[PDB]
Amino acid sequence: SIKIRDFGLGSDLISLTNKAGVTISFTNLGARIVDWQKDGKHLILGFDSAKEYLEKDAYPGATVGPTAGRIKDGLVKISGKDYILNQNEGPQTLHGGEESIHTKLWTYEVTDLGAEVQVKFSLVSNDGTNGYPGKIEMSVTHSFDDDNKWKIHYEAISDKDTVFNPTGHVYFNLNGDASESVENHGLRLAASRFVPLKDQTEIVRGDIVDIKNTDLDFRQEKQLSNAFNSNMEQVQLVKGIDHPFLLDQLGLDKEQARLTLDDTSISVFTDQPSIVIFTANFGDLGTLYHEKKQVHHGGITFACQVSPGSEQIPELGDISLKAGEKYQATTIYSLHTKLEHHHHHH
Amino acid sequence: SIKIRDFGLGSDLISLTNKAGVTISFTNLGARIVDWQKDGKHLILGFDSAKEYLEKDAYPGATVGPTAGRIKDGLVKISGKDYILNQNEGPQTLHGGEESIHTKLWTYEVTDLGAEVQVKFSLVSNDGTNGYPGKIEMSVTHSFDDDNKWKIHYEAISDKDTVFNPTGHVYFNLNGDASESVENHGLRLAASRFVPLKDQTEIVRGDIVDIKNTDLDFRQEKQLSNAFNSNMEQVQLVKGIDHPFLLDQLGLDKEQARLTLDDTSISVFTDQPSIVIFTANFGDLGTLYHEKKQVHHGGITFACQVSPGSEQIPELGDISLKAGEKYQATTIYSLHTKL
Ligand SMILES: OC[C@H]1O[C@@H](O)[C@H](O)[C@@H](O)[C@@H]1O
Numbered sequence: 095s096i097k098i099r100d101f102g103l104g105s106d107l108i109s110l111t112n113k114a115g116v117t118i119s120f121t122n123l124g125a126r127i128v129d130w131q132k133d134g135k136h137l138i139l140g141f142d143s144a145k146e147y148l149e150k151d152a153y154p155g156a157t158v159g160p161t162a163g164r165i166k167d168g169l170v171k172i173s174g175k176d177y178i179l180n181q182n183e184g185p186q187t188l189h190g191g192e193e194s195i196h197t198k199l200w201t202y203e204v205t206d207l208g209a210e211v212q213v214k215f216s217l218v219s220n221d222g223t224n225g226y227p228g229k230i231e232m233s234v235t236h237s238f239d240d241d242n243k244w245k246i247h248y249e250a251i252s253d254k255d256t257v258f259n260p261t262g263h264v265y266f267n268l269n270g271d272a273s274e275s276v277e278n279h280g281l282r283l284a285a286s287r288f289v290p291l292k293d294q295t296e297i298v299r300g301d302i303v304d305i306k307n308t309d310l311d312f313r314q315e316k317q318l319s320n321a322f323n324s325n326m327e328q329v330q331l332v333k334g335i336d337h338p339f340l341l342d343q344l345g346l347d348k349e350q351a352r353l354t355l356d357d358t359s360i361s362v363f364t365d366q367p368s369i370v371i372f373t374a375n376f377g378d379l380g381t382l383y384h385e386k387k388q389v390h391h392g393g394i395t396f397a398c399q400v401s402p403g404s405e406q407i408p409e410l411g412d413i414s415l416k417a418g419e420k421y422q423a424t425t426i427y428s429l430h431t432k433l434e435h436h437h438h439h440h
Numbered sequence: 441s442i443k444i445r446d447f448g449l450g451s452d453l454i455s456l457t458n459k460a461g462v463t464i465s466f467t468n469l470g471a472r473i474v475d476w477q478k479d480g481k482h483l484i485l486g487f488d489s490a491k492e493y494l495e496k497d498a499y500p501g502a503t504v505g506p507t508a509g510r511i512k513d514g515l516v517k518i519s520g521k522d523y524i525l526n527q528n529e530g531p532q533t534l535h536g537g538e539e540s541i542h543t544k545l546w547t548y549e550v551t552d553l554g555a556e557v558q559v560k561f562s563l564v565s566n567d568g569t570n571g572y573p574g575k576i577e578m579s580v581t582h583s584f585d586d587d588n589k590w591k592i593h594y595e596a597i598s599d600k601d602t603v604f605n606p607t608g609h610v611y612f613n614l615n616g617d618a619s620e621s622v623e624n625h626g627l628r629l630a631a632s633r634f635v636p637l638k639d640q641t642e643i644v645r646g647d648i649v650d651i652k653n654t655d656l657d658f659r660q661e662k663q664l665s666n667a668f669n670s671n672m673e674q675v676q677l678v679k680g681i682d683h684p685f686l687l688d689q690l691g692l693d694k695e696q697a698r699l700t701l702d703d704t705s706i707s708v709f710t711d712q713p714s715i716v717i718f719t720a721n722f723g724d725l726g727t728l729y730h731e732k733k734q735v736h737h738g739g740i741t742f743a744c745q746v747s748p749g750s751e752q753i754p755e756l757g758d759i760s761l762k763a764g765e766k767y768q769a770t771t772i773y774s775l776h777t778k779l
């Protein structure tokens with residue numbers, strides 16, 4: 095079933111329920127996921143109205159871009175030309191600059207395919223917006239099916255050579271309560287290397303480091319506390335995790351990550367080369383989610399994209415987008431029950 | 441009463457009915473007026489869904505900007521520097537450039553004051569959008585009251601020196617049907633001068649002309665057919681009217697224009713210096729409004745703003761907006777019925 099209602103400020107809330115009774119919801123404000131529940135428990139973090147997003151934190155569950163992450167000094171090189179983008183975090187351009195796409199009302203259309211329902215959100219990024227050459231016609235399609243798979247499909251075409259590498263900023267918290275840390279979750283992630291940050295400004299250091307056998311190695315499932323409790327310089331630097339992990343094997347076919355709590359698991363599939371993991375290292379900020387004060391480590395993202403820093407570390411990729419060339423990216427989060435035995439205590 | 445409903449593509453339709461039973465409706469798609477009716481008659485032109493506006497004509501009833509009208513070569517000088525805006529009509533920048541603010545979904549909030557209801561739409565134009573320095577936080581409040589007054593108040597603030605001169609693009613048609621020319625309406629206009637167009641590109645000619653005692657003098661009410669049957673080269677050039685008229689006296693308290701058809705009349709008030717009048721000179725286009733084929737001259741605008749062409753004729757005014765300055769503009773359309 096599909097249901098729609100106003101969500102505030104002129105935005106809408108589109109709620110879907112599949113045949114298994116799982117419900118998921120999105121808003122056109124930032125083409126974003128608002129909630130995902132199983133048996134009345136929230137699987138992700140979200141608010142109850144549009145205004146909260148705008149007043150508390152506008153990133154959660156959003157489509158962010160045109161370029162996800164931080165670009166050192168807002169400087170990109172496009173077809174031999176230097177361009178300075180909006181700098182909204184000191185001299186850095188973070189998540190596309192200020193008042194970016196995650197803050198806009200996108201138009202949308204719903205397509206009912208029976209076992210699958212699609213919500214295609216559209217938006218045009220005008221030429222020059224936040225310094226990006228364009229115009230860029232973008233669309234983000236969120237779909238949910240009878241097999242509990244939530245899929246995000248991005249498409250984009252630009253009138254001019256530009257840069258594009260958006261991502262989805264959902265935060266998971268299988269506790270279903272923001273006030274409960276995710277250190278009790280089990281994590282498996284198919285990555286042998288990571289990208290360290292230079293310092294507190296969070297730009298990339300310039301090197302790629304092997305994490306095998308460190309507290310950041312999750313090739314084999316381990317509890318998140320292992321990382322949170324780590325005194326590794328990088329962990330101490332950000333007070334948790336806030337890094338790109340380079341996937342060892344690429345392809346939409348491989349389960350790249352799996353997050354488990356008790357009998358529930360979320361599997362991550364993507365055609366992108368890296369996953370940026372940020373564990374809500376907000377300290378005592380205490381943003382209220384459904385009236386619960388969020389705790390430090392009260393959430394985790396799996397933002398799949400081309401790793402940030404490719405400006406300095408070309409080995410990471412090329413996010414350029416040629417005029418007329420069709421960009422496409424696909425990320426899938428699938429929900430499972432009793433996938434494995436995970437019975438722990440913290 | 442206030443009613444909100446889904447207008448298509450995720451946009452909303454907000455309809456306000458006042459104590460007199462008159463109904464006006466807006467959509468956040470473009471902070472625009474969609475309909476205005478009395479005794480089941482439409483007074484303005486509009487479509488029945490969001491898609492129609494995107495497919496047929498995105499201007500009708502919309503908030504257009506940041507700069508309304510045509511800018512020669514898309515060029516403006518800001519702080520002595522030349523800036524090139526998005527060119528969407530040849531080398532000209534018409535109504536803000538392609539995919540401008542009229543095609544965006546704006547956020548909004550409704551405020552019910554009893555005798556009056558206000559709908560405040562807001563949108564942020566990012567720095568560099570379509571070549572315009574910013575960011576510009578903009579808001580347009582459309583309100584409707586029990587006295588049948590529809591008012592539009594604009595406000596804006598920019599982080600950088602820029603240009604700003606928006607307008608409301610409603611088209612009136614007291615016939616209540618697009619297939620009927622407005623040539624039968626009577627128009628009164630408190631303007632003794634107009635801005636001639638250079639040619640078919642519609643950029644300004646460079647001069648200001650006195651229209652006293654010509655087919656375009658509407659200082660005393662007259663039927664539009666007059667102007668329509670004129671042999672003035674300017675009328676002939678565009679096949680109707682498509683020009684900025686310079687108001688004789690500035691100020692919100694003066695009725696600047698008045699459009700009349702039978703017992704029904706619309707009065708225009710504004711704090712702007714000019715009114716741009718365009719008589720839907722679409723020839724055979726035949727755009728469909730409520731299943732009715734539009735006819736050449738099947739509508740007329742009263743776009744209040746600073747006259748286009750100030751880039752070449754500085755006397756027209758100055759559209760700059762300095763960083764930190766708050767821009768404000770107000771335009772009111774008042775509906776009257778003779779008893
Ligand atoms: O929401 C704020 C957070 O956004 C994340 O996407 C970034 O990686 C964090 O460093 C930042 O503090």
Ligand SMILES: OC[C@H]1O[C@@H](O)[C@H](O)[C@@H](O)[C@@H]1O
Binds near residue numbers: 499500509642718
């Ligand atoms: O909507 C299209 C029309 O917009 C008006 O504001 C212009 O003056 C006309 O020349 C143009 O054809």
Ligand code: NA
Binds near residue numbers: 446
């Ligand atoms: Na709505």
